[PDB]
Ligand binder design. Structure first.
Ligand SMILES: CCc1ccccc1-c1ccc(C[NH2+]CCc2nc3ccccc3[nH]2)cc1Cl
Ligand SMILES: CCc1ccccc1-c1ccc(C[NH2+]CCc2nc3ccccc3[nH]2)cc1Cl
Ligand SMILES: CCc1ccccc1-c1ccc(C[NH2+]CCc2nc3ccccc3[nH]2)cc1Cl
Length: 327
């Protein structure tokens, strides 16, 4: 059987919490008044939800309304509990209300308003300084939820809202989030395929907060190397092959040997052998302005097969990549 694994930080935070903190199934949903909101314009969507800019008529304030489709609606208690637990934390989206549409029986989550800057245009414009600044903002959100015994499990650009005018960031869409309990075996079918950590791709269920740190490295790699997504797999097996063509197979087999992981028996024909690529092969004239030895050293410390060997969110914040960021 596989060798067990525990987080190297915030391991015991949920054991010292009363059961009401993490036992989301026992939480009672206090439903607000849906007549308190007027839908103004669509901001965007997801496979799980329809997102709108709205007005809260009880205080004439702009709000964000997330209408949950049945897939997202199934896990509402867990999403609500996690949002309530993290409310007020650094760069965490603020849940303002929970409502239901009498006509369709569909629920919706109401959030604080975020004046979001263009998604497909933020990726193209952020300077070297901006990337460092915003990465540090994400790390504040990640260290916070991890410290509160929660794994986001869906870190990607679509789940990060940026108000570039006010240089404000929010870590959003906590629908896939989970409470970390040491020794617990989690479902690996979490997050987008592109941002999945190798622990998920190899069916290593006993994962932890470090999964978010892999996803954060995928984001950074994509940004500095101007390749979106950075690991573009066709399916879950191929996703690991894409990772292996950059990180090499040798470190991958050391990882599976360390935890005694069993791969599919056709593993040698699917994965084969691949050498570790040097980060310099991804550095060209058009992206060299985003690359520094500190960016590469930081990246290398996030994109590690061994989930126990990646920087934690707090250690990532001490990295020299962030020295030039005004604090
Ligand atoms: C149909 C949209 C919807 C979906 C899920 C939950 C609530 C509502 C809703 C229902 C009614 C109103 C009031 N409109 C004015 C506002 C809203 Cl936000
Ligand atoms: C390559 C990603 C990245 C790497 C390093 C630093 C920042 C970012 C980033 C982070 C976030 C965004 C903006 N993403 C917007 C996501 C979004 N907008 C929405 C609007 C409505 C509903 C959901 C929504 N999700 C853009 C970017 Cl470029
Ligand atoms: C049943 C335990 C077992 C005993 C002996 C040999 C293999 C397995 C096994 C163990 C796990 C799985 C499913 N997980 C496969 C993970 C995986 N992802 C890959 C991506 C690329 C290449 C191989 C890959 N294998 C399938 C299997 Cl068959």
């Amino acid at each position: 059987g596989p060798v067990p694994s525990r987080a190297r930080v915030y391991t015991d935070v949920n054991t010292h919490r009363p059961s009401e903190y993490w036992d989301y199934e026992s939480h009672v949903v206090e439903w607000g008044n849906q007549d308190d909101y007027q839908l103004v314009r669509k901001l965007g969507r997801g496979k799980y939800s329809e997102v709108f800019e709205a007005i809260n008529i009880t205080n004439n304030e702009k709000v964000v309304v997330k209408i949950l489709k049945p897939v997202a609606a199934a896990k509402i208690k867990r999403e609500i509990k996690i949002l309530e637990n993290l409310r007020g934390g650094p760069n965490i989206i603020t849940l303002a209300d929970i409502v239901k549409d009498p006509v369709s029986r569909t629920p919706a989550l109401v959030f604080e308003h975020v004046n979001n800057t263009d998604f497909k245009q933020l990726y193209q414009t952020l300077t070297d300084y901006d990337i460092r600044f915003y990465m540090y903002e994400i790390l504040k959100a990640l260290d916070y939820c991890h410290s509160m015994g929660i794994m986001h499990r869906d870190v990607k650009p679509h789940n990060v809202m940026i108000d570039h005018e006010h240089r404000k960031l929010r870590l959003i869409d906590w629908g896939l989030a989970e409470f970390y309990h040491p020794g617990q075996e989690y479902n690996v079918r979490v997050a987008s395929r592109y941002f999945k950590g190798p622990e998920l791709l190899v069916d290593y269920q006993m994962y932890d907060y470090s999964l978010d740190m892999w996803s954060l490295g995928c984001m950074l790699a994509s940004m500095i190397f101007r390749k979106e997504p950075f690991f573009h797999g066709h399916d879950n097996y191929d996703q690991l092959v894409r990772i292996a063509k950059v990180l090499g197979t040798e470190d991958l087999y050391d990882y599976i040997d360390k935890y005694n992981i069993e791969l599919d028996p056709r593993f040698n024909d699917i994965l084969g052998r691949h050498s570790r690529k040097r980060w310099e092969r991804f550095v060209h004239s058009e992206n060299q302005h985003l690359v520094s030895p500190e960016a590469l050293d930081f990246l290398d410390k996030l994109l590690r097969y061994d989930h126990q060997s990646r920087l934690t969110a707090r250690e990532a914040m001490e990295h020299p990549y962030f020295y030039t960021v005004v604090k």
